[PDB]
């Protein structure tokens, strides 16, 4: 990370880390905290 940054300096539901289908499945069951569908 540091090494690659140094040279450069000189010059879907990824929010929850779930598959987009799965987030629906979890949220419908009420499993996610505070995710109420409206």
């Amino acid at each position: 990370a540091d090494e690659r940054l140094r040279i450069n300096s000189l010059r879907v539901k990824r929010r929850w880390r779930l598959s987009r289908i799965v987030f629906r499945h979890l949220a419908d069951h009420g499993q996610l905290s505070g995710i109420q569908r409206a």
Partner: protein, 126 residues
Amino acid sequence: RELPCAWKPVTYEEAHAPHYIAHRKGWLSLHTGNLDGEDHAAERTVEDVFLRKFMWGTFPGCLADQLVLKRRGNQLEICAVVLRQLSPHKYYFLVGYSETLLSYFYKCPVRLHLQTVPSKVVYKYL
């Protein structure tokens, strides 16, 4: 012959539809991570996924209804509801095993709160 002659019980969580999650139903897992400004929501969700799989696999056919995964501070309370089919010795052994396994899994003080019921508590029928 010729062509012309031819020509379920549901529990409370199961019974109610998803659009009652804040009207009639509740939330199984309760954590602050998803709130505004709070972090690590995805981490908590991944922990919940594994925890539910591991409970359902460590108590096969025993859980009467879904878990309740509460978290206060670093605590992790699994308030589960199971049946009275297994022997109490097996329940105690599984409680100890799963508690220790999860406490060393997440490096946090996990705990179990098994609640035995005689049978599935059916709400209605669909």
